[PDB]
């Protein structure tokens, strides 16, 4: 089963809480946060299979808004990371993310499988969608690995 646009997914990263790893889910309601309204769909325009190096939108299902890298750096105590949040507007590059493999055992232009560990690169700011500690998401120079499950 490959990953496709319009398929409702949960977007997860591993966090190391009490020296204990668990899978956390991206959520939102105007910035983004983590939990475990966690439902997302990949899109290519305002159910095609996604390829690595494809730029995509992440549409939040409850709200209908998109995950966009912001200007501001207010959620972070690293001032080189940008805030990530929901935006209704989708002209410009800020709501766009390119998908990359975690592993060398996956190539650019290849089909993105479910259960593939993913790296998500902001088109406008060239930063990664990034897990930060509470736990939040920002856009930073350090990579975080994301995986997608069906929901």
């Amino acid at each position: 089963q490959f990953l496709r646009t319009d398929d409702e997914v949960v977007l997860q990263c591993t966090a190391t809480i009490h020296k204990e790893q668990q899978k956390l889910c991206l959520a939102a309601e105007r910035l983004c946060f983590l939990e475990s309204v966690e439902k997302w769909k990949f899109m290519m325009k305002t159910h095609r299979t996604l390829l690595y190096g494809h730029a995509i939108l992440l549409r939040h299902s409850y709200s209908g808004m998109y995950l966009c890298c912001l200007s501001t750096s207010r959620s972070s105590t690293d001032k080189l990371a940008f805030d990530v949040g929901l935006q209704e507007d989708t002209t410009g590059e800020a709501c766009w993310w390119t998908i990359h493999p975690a592993s060398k055992q996956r190539s650019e232009g290849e089909k993105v499988r479910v259960g593939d560990d993913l790296i998500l690169v902001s088109v406008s700011s060239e930063r990664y969608l990034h897990l930060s500690y509470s736990w939040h998401v920002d856009a930073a120079f350090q990579q975080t690995l994301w995986s997608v499950a069906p929901i």
Side-chain angles (χ1 to χ4, degrees), residues 2-18 20-28 32-34 36 38-44 46-47 49-76 78-87 89-103 106 108-116 118-132 134-150:
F2 307 98
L3 173 60
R4 307 178 305 180
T5 61
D6 314 277
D7 283 340
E8 273 217 292
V9 291
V10 158
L11 189 67
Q12 294 183 298
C13 57
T14 304
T16 309
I17 290 164
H18 286 28
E20 172 124 338
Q21 293 187 164
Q22 59 188 82
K23 278 264 143 207
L24 306 183
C25 283
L26 191 71
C32 279
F33 62 104
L34 291 135
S36 187
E38 297 151 356
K39 286 193 194 157
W40 300 86
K41 296 199 227 276
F42 291 79
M43 7 220 63
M44 280 167 65
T46 308
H47 305 247
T49 69
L50 269 346
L51 319 173
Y52 287 103
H54 262 26
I56 48 79
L57 262 1
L58 270 173
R59 179 172 176 279
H60 185 245
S61 305
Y62 192 87
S63 69
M65 299 189 295
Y66 302 84
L67 183 91
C68 316
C69 181
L70 313 180
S71 299
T72 46
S73 306
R74 297 165 92 262
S75 84
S76 60
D78 170 24
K79 289 302 174 218
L80 301 173
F82 297 131
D83 295 334
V84 169
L86 298 186
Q87 216 172 95
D89 192 58
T90 321
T91 322
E93 295 173 359
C95 301
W96 295 84
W97 304 84
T98 140
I99 304 167
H100 296 109
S103 90
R106 221 68 108 204
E108 209 83 344
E110 281 180 354
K111 289 191 179 109
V112 174
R113 285 141 194 87
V114 185
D116 275 359
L118 308 177
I119 281 154
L120 296 169
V121 178
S122 166
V123 165
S124 71
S125 76
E126 301 199 77
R127 303 280 178 61
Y128 303 101
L129 190 69
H130 170 75
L131 169 75
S132 188
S134 67
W135 288 102
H136 60 268
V137 80
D138 58 25
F141 291 129
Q142 302 79 204
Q143 74 179 32
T144 297
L145 309 175
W146 298 90
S147 51
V148 177

